[PDB]
């Protein structure tokens with residue numbers, strides 16, 4: 001596995017007009033999946049990380065916006081990174097996006113971290129773009145290889161015992177952190193339960209307790225659910241993604257929860273910005289932003 005040649009070819013399109021492809025070989029991508037799969041399984045499903053680090057939200061195959069994020073925050077390993085999921089679907093270059101993230105995960109396994117989003121489930125990315133991109137530019141056998149790799153991704157992370165990070169949000173079945181550590185890998189994403197909620201649920205300011213979710217799966221939760229959860233587990237903040245927001249970041253429940261979305265001009269329809277959160281040594285949060293077109 002010529003990791004440096006793979007990374008060099010991926011960063012080579014820096015400065016080009018967005019849309020230009022990086023077509024790695026079939027065997028190189030297969031090696032990225034298998035090797036990163038081993039590292040995911042060797043590390044806990046509930047990561048315990050330390051600040052300072054940068055946290056990014058949804059990317060959704062917007063590869064040149066991912067390159068802009070590294071230009072703003074520093075290419076690895078100049079800064080520690082935690083991504084919250086949703087690397088494929090919706091966008092035009094899911095392949096370049098996930099390949100660079102897997103390559104960086106292999107080269108810097110203890111300074112680069114990737115969480116699982118709801119689009120890292122096979123039933124979702126079969127419909128919303130990644131399957132068609134794999135079938136067109138490679139083959140469906142490689143798509144299954146990606147799927148086997150996604151099945152081993154960690155699902156949550158706690159930064160310095162104070163910031164709880166996951167893709168979606170909280171769960172009515174989440175009573176102990178040990179419930180997350182007991183989840184065995186590899187695994188598919190069920191249509192209900194704790195693992196489903198951590199990848200699907202959303203906060204809602206017009207809901208008391210647990211409500212229904214407009215996505216057709218999981219639940220919504222209100223501000224008091226967040227406050228009680230933080231107090232019970234001695235936490236300061238819940239950091240999640242999952243929802244496109246106009247400013248790229250959006251606080252909730254008196255700045256006790258923050259939503260991160262790192263894909264500006266989301267799939268050509270929205271005029272949103274993309275945000276990346278910077279956590280310093282004292283856990284103070286600031287933002288670097290890709291402003292909309």
Ligand SMILES: */C=C/C(=C/C(=O)C[C@H](C)C[C@@H](C)CC[C@H](O)[C@H](C)C(=O)C[C@@H](O)[C@H](C)[C@@H](C)OC(=O)C[C@@H](O)/C(C(=O)O)=C(\C)C(=O)O)CC
Nearest residue numbers: 090121122123124189190191192214215216217242243244
């Ligand atoms: C792992 C496999 C698996 C998945 C399931 O659980 C399937 C569930 C039971 C049923 C399917 C039909 C749910 C699919 C969702 O409805 C889709 C993915 C969805 O969320 C569309 C989204 O637009 C909903 C409808 C919308 C109300 O939410 C938003 O607007 C959020 C917005 O940020 C967003 C997004 O999806 O992130 C947008 C605008 C987007 O569509 O890209 C088990 C079988």
Ligand SMILES: [Cl-]
Nearest residue numbers: 209222224225
């Ligand atoms: Cl509530």
Ligand SMILES: [Cl-]
Nearest residue numbers: 072287288289
């Ligand atoms: Cl900025």
Ligand SMILES: [Cl-]
Nearest residue numbers: 289290291292
């Ligand atoms: Cl500006």
Ligand SMILES: [Mn+2]
Nearest residue numbers: 086117118242
């Ligand atoms: Mn999502």
Ligand SMILES: [Mn+2]
Nearest residue numbers: 058086242243
């Ligand atoms: Mn998303």
